[PDB]
Symmetry: D2
Subunit: 293 residues, 4 copies
């Protein structure tokens, strides 16, 4: 069965103004590439090629102008708008006809993931054709997230959205896998007390049916979010340190598509040409004539 | 006499791609505000209110959308396009009718300055109504800049553009003050195929009309031209702002302190942004004395 | 009249353990040099050559091993021990016979200052031979410091130590100048069980002898008291040094520029370090003019 | 068969002066703990409890004063001096009687490792009772390291120490596993043209006998070194970003010994007591009453 992807690139409102008066949030760079390359790479590493980008009416054309239809990277990218920021779970109503009767995956536009065998840790989630899969990650400030409570045998028994009194330090990360029920679950939701269709309510719905798999994303993975000026900066420094140490890029879509066999050596060479003058083009050119294990 | 300002916010080419496939370099943020706010604040701190922004045809509307005509901040901002990146000295040909018969000042769009009594160090340059003024600053890699050589008595005797063998570690920073002769000097290419600002400055030096002031080690002059240096500049500005609770290069603040806009106008500007830290900061400025 | 200096480099307790189980906080490096070089350079920039370092019994030998008696840098460094951390004002009782009948200056061991004409901003404080002088600096978290309140005409009217409800955002920085009365003021505990420097400063304020000078936003005053702030201060100093090719708080440099040691002495100091960047930097200073 | 560990904490000379006039290099902190906690944690994660720390005559007592005999953390730590920095391979001559007839592992004192299932990636190396095991890692500046060349089928065929013209971008990291031959291999070495007993010559000796296993440490691992002022700073920022995001520490020996079952809850509580006032003590206390997966 096919799995489709959605990237939710919502409007951060005026919270990052005036930086985001110039460019949309998920167009801001993290070190050396646009923020949106990171969640796109995550979907690509899960084996997902068919992807809907959802953003504001102002920002959608800008994502389109940047990314096109994805064919240069062996992807099929489509676009849709969220007129009003009425909660993340709206992505499934907006995305209803894109999803059709297929399996899906949702990723937040400002989330970055780094670590080992990331290709394989997503594989187990992506292959599960029934129910929902999410990842829990130990954090210092769980109040800011969806928080998962486990019983004494490590079984997930409760999910709470931004609790004032968190039950654990396990946050739910911004990457979600769903089966064919998610659209119908979303339509039956009622708005929260904040006036939003919450993704945690979608996840609670699967939990109450005993169909939520909660996998642990271990301490040896980096899950970062780029939602404040401070966290964007930190994420920049983190990616720069890795790239400058390794001479290998994090979340380079051209590279990921080449290694996945979605584009070939000739196509990668064409992509490198316009950028040959700068470090990013030189990097893509180097990939053709080097074995990276 | 009036002094007009020019900000050269040109096409970064492909050097910062793909980050700048989203936008021109001078729209990228340095920590919490667009790059272009920093050179704009420098011009404002020199007392300059009438400013021409020069950028690519593609980027001009984006600067316009960000900054408008400047009237909200007591400024008069105008725009011009540079079809092709043919050297920094082209700013005076493109900007010829904007400048008219007035004094001018040119600043590069990716330069940031921080330090003490900055308002006052620019004052002496801005109020000199004859000849040209530039600033020299000790750097580690002078080969990347215009380099000034001094004689034993501290007099400038030579300028060189990006020398492979620099004569000193004094770079000429990206801020230049000119009198009414600069357009005519400019109208009169290098081996690289560009109209060099260093040739304009050499022209003033050879007629004995170049003031070279030292910008001391207690000032920060940073360049935001690479991915690495943009990140560094971000960390630097964050550290200062988070330490002080005072912003670097907030134009609304600078206009308010210059008396270009008043308390009521500042309050209006703060309203739309009230929900975020930047709006809250502008609101706090109304009810606090900063010395 | 002579002014003597004191650096309080006391026991950080257990707050930075286990990092400081290796050494006292003021021996940790800020980027490329020990923390203590920064407050020592501040005292030197004020013209102070005779300096008492106060630290724990365990740490004193380590400071001594690092710094010696100071003669290599044209200084006279003396050491005293603080058995117990009983407040910053204890420095004047411990330091009583070192001070004698002279003027004094106290600096905290984990404070760093950067900015323009810093030599000259300290000069006005250092040369005031009567009363006390402190500096006020706008900060984001004034609750962590001594806080000064000003009246409508910018006169200091109140000082409070770590107030839960600060009257302003002006903190008193960790650098203090005193006349001959401070020892007697000091000899005359808070609810926390400590001899507070803010009580010493209040005493001078109540006799109308406290000069409170503003350290403006164009200066950097950083505190290296947490793991996070020490890291930030490191990044800040690295950015400046790597931009300029000039060091912050290099005592050998400061002594050379103050004329306390000469070219031959500086060359001797550079020899043992010739293999690393710090030695190479001292060697470069001999054959370059820095304005 | 037992495996013993050596941490080489050598004298960086005057290269980091004057910072290292106050404290020895491997006593400098990386963010919130002494540099040496990081390579010690690496050895502990390989299951090694018996460890020799080698450093200069000036620095050895300082390591002793910091770490003791290791019994508080369920370790057995011993100390030895290297009078003169005559190459890293000297560690096996100095360490000869400590090693005895056992298997060994050498780790450099200024190397930091971060990533997933790190416990398990070392397990395969630690269990190999014959020959030597090293790790290769893609880097940007391979000239600074021991560089491994691979043939077309991914077999290691050459090792070069700091080559002017590197054959690949695969550096050998500062962690080495050896069998009972390493002492004898080291004694038969001749000094290099630089006047040092090189670890690369020890590794070449195993390669020429076909007994060098070279495993790839993938791009999803962070291998950092803390040998310059700049790299020490970068490593600090990197560790701070991870710790402040996760509320979990990197390379906390007390934690690693507790999770390995080398010390128990009561012993961990005793260790936390003296430090209760600060964040590190509070962290150890929190570990007693939380499940970390
Ligand atoms: O940020 C990344 C993470 C990553 O794992 N990779 C390697 C991905 C890969 C490897 C082999 C087969 C298929 C895919 C990457 O190019 N960039
Ligand atoms: O980035 C800055 C640097 C600065 O100096 N200032 C102070 C400006 C000022 C102008 C006129 C009278 C008094 C103060 C600022 O608001 N932002
Ligand atoms: O950290 C610093 C800050 C500073 O201003 N200086 C310049 C000191 C000086 C002293 C006397 C005459 C001229 C210059 C320095 O060498 N290191
Ligand atoms: O820097 C680290 C890396 C690490 O993996 N861990 C967990 C280690 C562990 C887990 C389970 C059983 C045995 C050991 C750690 O405490 N600190
Ligand atoms: Cl893990
Ligand atoms: Cl200066
Ligand atoms: Cl100032
Ligand atoms: Cl990997």
């Amino acid at each position: 069965m096919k799995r489709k992807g959605i990237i939710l690139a919502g409007g951060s409102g005026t919270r990052l103004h005036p930086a985001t008066l110039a460019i949309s949030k998920q167009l801001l760079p993290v070190y050396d590439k646009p923020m949106i390359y990171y969640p796109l790479s995550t979907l690509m590493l899960a084996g997902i090629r068919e992807i809907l980008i959802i953003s504001t009416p102002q920002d959608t054309p800008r994502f389109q102008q940047l990314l096109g239809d994805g064919s240069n990277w062996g992807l099929d990218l489509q676009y849709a708008v969220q007129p009003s920021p009425d909660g993340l779970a709206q992505a499934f109503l907006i995305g209803e006809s894109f999803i059709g009767n297929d399996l899906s995956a949702l990723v937040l536009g400002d989330n970055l993931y780094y670590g080992h065998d990331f290709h394989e840790l997503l594989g187990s989630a992506s292959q599960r054709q029934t129910g929902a899969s999410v990842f829990a990650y130990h954090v210092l400030d769980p109040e800011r997230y969806g928080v998962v409570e486990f019983d004494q045998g490590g079984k997930a028994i409760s999910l709470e959205e931004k609790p004032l009194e968190p039950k654990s330090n396990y946050a739910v990360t911004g990457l979600y896998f769903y089966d064919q029920q998610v659209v119908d679950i979303a339509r039956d939701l009622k708005p929260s007390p904040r006036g939003e269709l919450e993704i945690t309510d979608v996840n609670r719905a699967y939990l109450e049916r005993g169909q939520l798999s909660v996998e642990i994303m271990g301490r040896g993975y980096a899950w970062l979010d780029t939602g404040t000026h401070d966290s964007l900066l930190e994420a920049g420094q983190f990616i720069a340190t890795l790239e400058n140490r390794q001479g290998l890029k994090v979340a380079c879509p051209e590279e990921i598509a080449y290694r996945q066999k979605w584009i070939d050596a000739a196509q990668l060479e064409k992509l490198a040409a316009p950028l040959a003058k700068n470090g990013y083009g030189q990097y893509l050119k180097r990939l053709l004539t080097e074995t990276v294990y």
